[PDB]
Amino acid sequence: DCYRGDGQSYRGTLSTTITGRTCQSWSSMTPHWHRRIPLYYPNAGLTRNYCRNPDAEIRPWCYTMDPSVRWEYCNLTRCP
Amino acid sequence: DCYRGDGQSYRGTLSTTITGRTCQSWSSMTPHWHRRIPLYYPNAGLTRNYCRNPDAEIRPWCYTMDPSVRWEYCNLTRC
Amino acid sequence: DCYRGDGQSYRGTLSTTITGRTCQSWSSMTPHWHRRIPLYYPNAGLTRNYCRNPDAEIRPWCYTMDPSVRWEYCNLTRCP
Ligand SMILES: O=C(O)[C@@H](Cc1cccc(CN(Cc2cccc(C[C@H](C(=O)O)[C@H]3CCNC3)c2)Cc2cccc(C[C@H](C(=O)O)[C@H]3CCNC3)c2)c1)[C@H]1CCNC1
């Protein structure tokens, strides 16, 4: 599994961060309250807890299930 | 008056930061808008402007009344 | 074109950050959702996308048109 460019187009199902943490669901505010919700980013594919890039970071990312770690990049490599 | 561990259990009355600033009230959104509110933290004892640790910081903290400084650790020692 | 004190009083028309990005409009909620609007800061001169200091930063600042970069200080030096 891989991403192209900055990964805004990435629509895979990876839900694990670079440090092995589980992604938080985009539709949950727990443990991290956020504004990266389907209502505000309807074309960004904010499904379940999948790694995404709704706000033009360098690569796909997610909020994490670890209360002490708000968000991280995903364990995902750049495409050949 | 002191905290144990990471101070998630702290329920004392200290309301002052490690720089001497006064804590903002948890129920207040001014000068700092936030979501450390009883709705998302029912167990956290978020009362008045008391130093608390709802969200697993390393020690009790509060939003500060200084508009320049969003939040700081509290002037509290470990038991 | 410069700021006095920490620039709370500043009402010039600069709309460019330190890294040369352009300010988002204060009334606009896109790309960054925020609280710094005419309602919650009534005397701050939150007009168009002009560099302001309503919330007691060290210097005037703005939210940026870059969706990733939330806010930056403006390219404005202090008055001599
Ligand atoms: O992470 C994000 O969601 C995204 C960035 C983002 C977007 C929108 C708003 C924020 C800011 N929030 C906190 C916050 C709320 C109100 C106001 C501010 C500060 C102001 C502002 O940024 O509007 C500035 C403006 C100029 N001087 C102050 C900050 C972020 C926030 C939201 C919830 C909790 C915290 C951390 C806690 C807090 O500050 O509660 C601290 C408090 C102690 N424990 C943790 C921080 C951040 C990134 C994710 C990947 N892409 C970008």
Author numbering:
A (entry chain A), C (entry chain C): 0 to 79
B (entry chain B): 0 to 78
The authors write:
Lp(a) is a lipoprotein particle that is formed by a two-step process involving interactions between a LDL particle and another protein, apo(a). In summary, we report the discovery and optimization of potent and selective small-molecule inhibitors of Lp(a) formation by exploiting the repeated KIV domain structure of apo(a) through compound multivalency.
Taking further advantage of multivalency, a trimeric molecule, LY3473329, was synthesized. A comparison of residues near the inhibitor-binding site reveals that only human PLG K-2 preserves the DxE side chains that make key interactions with LY3473329. Oral doses of prototype compounds and a potent, multivalent disruptor, LY3473329 (muvalaplin), reduced the levels of Lp(a) in transgenic mice and in cynomolgus monkeys. These data support the clinical development of LY3473329—which is already in phase 2 studies—as a potent and specific orally administered agent for reducing the levels of Lp(a).
